[PDB]
Amino acid sequence: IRAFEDPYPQVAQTLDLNTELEEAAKFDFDNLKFRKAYFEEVHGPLEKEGVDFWWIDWQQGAISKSGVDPLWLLNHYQYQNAQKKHKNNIILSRYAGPGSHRYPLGFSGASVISWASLDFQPYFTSTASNIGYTWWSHDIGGHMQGYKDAELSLRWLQFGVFSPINRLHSSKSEFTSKEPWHFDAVIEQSMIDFLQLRHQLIPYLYSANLITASEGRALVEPLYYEYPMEEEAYQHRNQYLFGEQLMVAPITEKMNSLLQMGSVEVWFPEGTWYDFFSGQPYDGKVSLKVYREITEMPVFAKAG
Amino acid sequence: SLRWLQFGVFSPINRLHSSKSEFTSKEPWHFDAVIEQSMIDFLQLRHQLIPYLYSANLITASEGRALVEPLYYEYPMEEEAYQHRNQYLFGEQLMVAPITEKMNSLLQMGSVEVWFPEGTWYDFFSGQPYDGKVSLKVYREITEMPVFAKAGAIIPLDKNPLKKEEIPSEIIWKIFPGADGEYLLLEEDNETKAEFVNGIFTVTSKKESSRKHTIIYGEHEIVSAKRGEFSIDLNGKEENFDWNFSTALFRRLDIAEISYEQKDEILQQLSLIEEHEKQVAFIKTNENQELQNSLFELLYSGK
Amino acid sequence: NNNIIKFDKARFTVLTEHLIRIEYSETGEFEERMTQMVQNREFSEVNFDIIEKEETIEIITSTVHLYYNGGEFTNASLFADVKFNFSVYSNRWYFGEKSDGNLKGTTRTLDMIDGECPLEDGIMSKNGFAVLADKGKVLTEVGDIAGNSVSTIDLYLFAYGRDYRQALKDFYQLTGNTPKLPRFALGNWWSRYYDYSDKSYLALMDKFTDKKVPLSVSVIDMDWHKVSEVPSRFGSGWTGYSWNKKLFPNPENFIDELHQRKLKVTLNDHPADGIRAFEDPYPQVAQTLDLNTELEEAAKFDFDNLKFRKAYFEEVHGPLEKEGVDFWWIDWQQGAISKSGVDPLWLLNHYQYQNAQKKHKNNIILSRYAGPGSHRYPLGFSGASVISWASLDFQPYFTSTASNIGYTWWSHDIGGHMQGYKDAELSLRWLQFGVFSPINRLHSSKSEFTSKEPWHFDAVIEQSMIDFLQLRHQLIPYLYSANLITASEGRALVEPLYYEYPMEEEAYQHRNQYLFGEQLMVAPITEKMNSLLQMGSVEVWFPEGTWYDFFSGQPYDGKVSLKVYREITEMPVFAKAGAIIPLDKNPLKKEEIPSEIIWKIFPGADGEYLLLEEDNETKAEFVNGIFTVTSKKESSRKHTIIYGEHEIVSAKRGEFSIDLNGKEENFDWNFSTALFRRLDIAEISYEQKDEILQQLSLIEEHEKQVAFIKTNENQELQNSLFELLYSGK
Numbered sequence A: 001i002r003a004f005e006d007p008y009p010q011v012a013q014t015l016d017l018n019t020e021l022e023e024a025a026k027f028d029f030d031n032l033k034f035r036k037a038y039f040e041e042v043h044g045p046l047e048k049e050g051v052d053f054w055w056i057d058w059q060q061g062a063i064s065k066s067g068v069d070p071l072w073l074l075n076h077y078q079y080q081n082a083q084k085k086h087k088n089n090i091i092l093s094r095y096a097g098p099g100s101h102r103y104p105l106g107f108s109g110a111s112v113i114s115w116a117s118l119d120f121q122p123y124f125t126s127t128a129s130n131i132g133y134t135w136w137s138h139d140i141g142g143h144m145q146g147y148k149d150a151e152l153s154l155r156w157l158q159f160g161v162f163s164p165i166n167r168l169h170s171s172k173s174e175f176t177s178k179e180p181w182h183f184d185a186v187i188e189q190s191m192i193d194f195l196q197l198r199h200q201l202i203p204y205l206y207s208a209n210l211i212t213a214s215e216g217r218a219l220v221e222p223l224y225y226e227y228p229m230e231e232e233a234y235q236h237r238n239q240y241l242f243g244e245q246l247m248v249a250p251i252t253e254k255m256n257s258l259l260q261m262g263s264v265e266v267w268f269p270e271g272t273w274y275d276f277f278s279g280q281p282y283d284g285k286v287s288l289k290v291y292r293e294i295t296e297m298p299v300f301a302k303a304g
Numbered sequence B: 001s002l003r004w005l006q007f008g009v010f011s012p013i014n015r016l017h018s019s020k021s022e023f024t025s026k027e028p029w030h031f032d033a034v035i036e037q038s039m040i041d042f043l044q045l046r047h048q049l050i051p052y053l054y055s056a057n058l059i060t061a062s063e064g065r066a067l068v069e070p071l072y073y074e075y076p077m078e079e080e081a082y083q084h085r086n087q088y089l090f091g092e093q094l095m096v097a098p099i100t101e102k103m104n105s106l107l108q109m110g111s112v113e114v115w116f117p118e119g120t121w122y123d124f125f126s127g128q129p130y131d132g133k134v135s136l137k138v139y140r141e142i143t144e145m146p147v148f149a150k151a152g153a154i155i156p157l158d159k160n161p162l163k164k165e166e167i168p169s170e171i172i173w174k175i176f177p178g179a180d181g182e183y184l185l186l187e188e189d190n191e192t193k194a195e196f197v198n199g200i201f202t203v204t205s206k207k208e209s210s211r212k213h214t215i216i217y218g219e220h221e222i223v224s225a226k227r228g229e230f231s232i233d234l235n236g237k238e239e240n241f242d243w244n245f246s247t248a249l250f251r252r253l254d255i256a257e258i259s260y261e262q263k264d265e266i267l268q269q270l271s272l273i274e275e276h277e278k279q280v281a282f283i284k285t286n287e288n289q290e291l292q293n294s295l296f297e298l299l300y301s302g303k
Numbered sequence C: 001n002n003n004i005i006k007f008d009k010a011r012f013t014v015l016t017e018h019l020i021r022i023e024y025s026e027t028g029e030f031e032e033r034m035t036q037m038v039q040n041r042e043f044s045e046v047n048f049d050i051i052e053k054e055e056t057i058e059i060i061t062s063t064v065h066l067y068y069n070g071g072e073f074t075n076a077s078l079f080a081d082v083k084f085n086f087s088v089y090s091n092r093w094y095f096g097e098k099s100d101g102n103l104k105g106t107t108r109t110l111d112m113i114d115g116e117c118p119l120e121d122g123i124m125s126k127n128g129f130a131v132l133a134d135k136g137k138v139l140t141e142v143g144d145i146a147g148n149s150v151s152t153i154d155l156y157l158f159a160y161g162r163d164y165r166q167a168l169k170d171f172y173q174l175t176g177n178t179p180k181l182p183r184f185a186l187g188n189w190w191s192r193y194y195d196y197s198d199k200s201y202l203a204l205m206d207k208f209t210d211k212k213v214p215l216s217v218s219v220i221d222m223d224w225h226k227v228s229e230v231p232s233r234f235g236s237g238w239t240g241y242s243w244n245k246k247l248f249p250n251p252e253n254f255i256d257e258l259h260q261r262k263l264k265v266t267l268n269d270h271p272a273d274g275i276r277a278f279e280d281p282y283p284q285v286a287q288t289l290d291l292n293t294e295l296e297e298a299a300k301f302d303f304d305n306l307k308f309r310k311a312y313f314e315e316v317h318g319p320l321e322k323e324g325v326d327f328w329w330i331d332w333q334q335g336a337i338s339k340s341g342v343d344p345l346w347l348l349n350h351y352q353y354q355n356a357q358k359k360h361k362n363n364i365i366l367s368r369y370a371g372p373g374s375h376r377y378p379l380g381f382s383g384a385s386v387i388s389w390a391s392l393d394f395q396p397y398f399t400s401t402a403s404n405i406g407y408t409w410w411s412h413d414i415g416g417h418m419q420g421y422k423d424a425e426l427s428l429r430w431l432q433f434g435v436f437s438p439i440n441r442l443h444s445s446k447s448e449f450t451s452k453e454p455w456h457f458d459a460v461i462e463q464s465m466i467d468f469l470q471l472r473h474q475l476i477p478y479l480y481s482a483n484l485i486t487a488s489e490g491r492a493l494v495e496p497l498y499y500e501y502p503m504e505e506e507a508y509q510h511r512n513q514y515l516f517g518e519q520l521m522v523a524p525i526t527e528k529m530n531s532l533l534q535m536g537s538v539e540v541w542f543p544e545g546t547w548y549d550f551f552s553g554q555p556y557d558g559k560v561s562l563k564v565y566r567e568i569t570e571m572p573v574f575a576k577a578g579a580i581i582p583l584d585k586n587p588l589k590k591e592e593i594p595s596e597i598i599w600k601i602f603p604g605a606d607g608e609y610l611l612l613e614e615d616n617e618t619k620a621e622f623v624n625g626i627f628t629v630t631s632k633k634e635s636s637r638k639h640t641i642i643y644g645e646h647e648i649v650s651a652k653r654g655e656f657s658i659d660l661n662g663k664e665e666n667f668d669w670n671f672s673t674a675l676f677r678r679l680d681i682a683e684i685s686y687e688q689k690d691e692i693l694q695q696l697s698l699i700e701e702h703e704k705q706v707a708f709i710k711t712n713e714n715q716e717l718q719n720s721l722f723e724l725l726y727s728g729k
């Protein structure tokens, strides 16, 4: 909190700063008086204007005199402080090491906008369950740099809708808005359909959320949680269970223009499986390349 | 399919036809929503052009002038009139340069090298201007076709192309500002002269009728559904189309499948650099050679 | 001591508003002695503010907040925020951590480097701060190594923002200014790793004369001494201090012959095997150092040892200096190991440079870079670069970036040293760069195939190399004046563009582009020509203003980034409107200072040039079209004036003024002539040549000429034709 800030006079009084030398209240989350002034006199007036929760966007390193990562101090203390004004409140912040699942939500940050980034992200998300960090929020469509491809944006939103959190976000570019009507009529309508589907899924998501909290079961599981002895459960990195009733195989590669369809190799466990959208059936157990138009996503449900 | 229909609409006859395949129907709704809507728009445009076509037809029959002329009929001594095989005059008021090559996916636009004869030319759809004489690569999205009109062009259009009626009950007179012009609309049982002289637009006919005339002067509808012969002074009215460099630049950068850093730098630099010659020098450094030509078309129109 | 603050075990010295010394001492004693790096901590008093509490201290200057929270220096206890917004969150220094932004400095050598190598940091940062750690030994008042500093951490925080020239000036105040070079150092040097005889060396020097190539320096490489004649029991012949008597039967006579030709003479010295029992000076060194001669005990190289250094200077170098050796080429490649912990290369450069001043005023060495402050011992010797386009393409960037750690007299092997591959165009481009570099020393490997003699090459390459070699001597007045400005004002001859244009992004995007003195901007071509154009090219950033090609007068309107094309015989060098460049009219003439100066004036603006010389200062002023020349002292010097294209005044003596408002401002350079020449040399279709010449002649409107070239299927030909249209606009 530097001397030009609206809260500076109050913080300066609380922390006995030299206002005529414009002494800054430097960031110091090791310091109880700094933390109290930050929550009460910096955040407090903004919460009184109606701010519901904090997006902690920390990128300035792991250094403190205590040896505790400032990101851990922020997530631990801000998450606790957030519970004062709202029941079951959240933060939005980067991962701060094992146990930092206690401070949801995860914020993965400034991914490069590319097919390669999207192709990593389902694997990244399900693998995080292996250290109990089950509420990653990715920038849906990618954050910055990279390149334009409306199909990439649409595939990324498909994944997002079947991810822990569906937060559309972008860079300072005039050219990277995630608004559906940025794109052509086909892309726009498909994005609107998937965005509506996210809200249709809130009952299922909220029920899974209460199961994470009470039973320690992740919403997104790698295949090997359910099928630990099946070699194929270790060979489909981007394939996952989504709650207990759905199995997702996002398409994360640009379509084959000769087919006008993208594809992904799906492992179907034993049993009869149905495409969640079309009812197309599949007899497990089998590994089978599946093809979808850019407007359609491979999501499957078992008989029953 | 869409590029072929664009050409067809600006050809002597617009007959959709196909093979015995289950897969080759020319129905617009065979295709996706973007292609369908564009095909419907071009199919409606064909019927808007029937007055112009029927008048040209009577000129073929009576005067021996083709509807579709190679450039060298009008410009026999211009070498460039022999170097643009697919470019043609369509009646006396329009010049067509169909795009007949698959789009460049990095630009999301197709292109054609256009020869612009001497004079000031306007895109018939957008009003984008071009100073002739020049040979210039022009870029269009798959939904847009290069069709051009000179300053002073007057093109009649059927206002009600869906309406079943032997002759139009309403004509739109589309006028391109910047020069005098004239158009004679020959019909089954009439002749109607539209004259544009020192900014005065006059419509007269051999026989009287209940036909309602609409006037569009550049961008703006000036007269709606006026009956009978009349004259209106357009010297007072806005000559300029809305088409502007900045809007067109943003749209081309926005659709392009290129790096966002390149989009940001081009938009910033072309906004900041004031001198036209230095804007051209900036785009001359671009590593994408086709993007250079696309940006050069916008700078040439905005010069 | 107002500018000195102690807190806990630390000491802070506010040297300038933008420079703070930071020390730690366990013993509570802090270091006042000079170090290998630091020669002077006397700076004028400055104002700053302190916030001192029980547990913390904050020092506040116009540009930085320095914080210390007590205890040992860590990334948490010692850190600084700059008062700039050049970045969003790279504005904080943490002790012991790296931040983004450093514009780099230099490195020891280009030995064995093909193209790029990593550089050390310099004191310049785009984000406005840099830390220079002093890890060196303390010196005595006379400059011997005294041992370890009592300041066990000793740092300099630079917070100059993008005032790079002031950062460098204050670095020279802290570490000592660069000394003046002698004028001879700025001419052409001849060198080759080749077993010349006295006879064949003098024959080559006389061939240079016959060929109209001026030289200032005759280097004799290691085959001057015994090599194959060294018995293998002693190790190799690499180190030597004994003339090969077959090649040099009378060394003093041979050096007298080079001196009669007005050449300065240096010998290669490989010091690392010291003075072994076969050497001519060994009996004297053995006596001085009490060596066991019957066991042939070697005087091993030991620059930590005062008696070794004295025997080296007095009894090894001394007899060779008496034969006429003018200065030493120290060629050290055998590592950084000594019992003192001081790099032997630093000991050599420090002590040899000092020793060189005994027999010659403003004498030099030639040696590799020995770390920050080693600018005090010019000249830099970059060494054994690989002969390649990649090496040449690195070298302008390398040279201008070195100014960021104050090391402004790099001498590169012009044309590259060794290995690599033959390409006469590479050799010619490398010489073009060399002529516009700090030092122009031709040198090569032991290959029979790598001589840099111009007449090694074909008649076209030979004539161009001769022309550039003559141009180097024409530029000696300009170089010598810039040299005196380095020594007195701390301004580098070669500056990166961002010294003059710190806020222009394009000044950071033209790595090989540089200012050369204050009147010229150089963009060397460092890529093989496009055979379809028969021209090489480089993207040039033209700052605001009107610029002229220094050779052709081709004009360019800044600000613009523009690809420029030149034949292999021509180099992109530019001067602003109002530039005044002195040239020696008689570059082949042997004379201590020019008897005649050409004043080359670029029309279109006011200008000024100060020619600093050994015993004079001469001011050329161009103000409202009036050109005036005045000097402190009078002389018989004859002044020639060239105003744009035309010689206005020939060989006029004394001070004078001439009005040039009446005279032709325009160069002859014209679009049509240049277009014809580019089309004529191009290896393209004659139908294309015909069409381009016809269309560009017929089309009147500039915008439509550009539209015509925009349709060309040859993308590089478009850019070449666009350069001509831009200049002709």
Ligand SMILES: OC[C@H]1O[C@H](O[C@@H]2[C@@H](O)[C@@H](O)O[C@H](CO)[C@H]2O)[C@H](O)[C@@H](O)[C@@H]1O
Pocket: A057, A059, A109, A110, A144, A170, A171, A172
């Ligand atoms: O708050 C603005 C954004 O800040 C962070 O991302 C920055 C990014 O958008 C761009 O400006 O680059 C910098 C340097 O890499 C990033 O720090 C957050 O990650 C982002 O979510 C914000 O929108």
Ligand SMILES: OC[C@H]1O[C@H](O[C@@H]2[C@@H](O)[C@@H](O)O[C@H](CO)[C@H]2O)[C@H](O)[C@@H](O)[C@@H]1O
Pocket: C112, C192, C193, C221, C222, C268, C331, C333, C383, C384, C418, C444, C445, C446
């Ligand atoms: O004194 C002879 C040369 O020695 C050094 O370069 C050597 C080089 O020419 C070749 O022989 O390879 C060795 C091993 O890499 C180098 O040490 C100097 O760098 C050079 O300037 C001399 O001419």
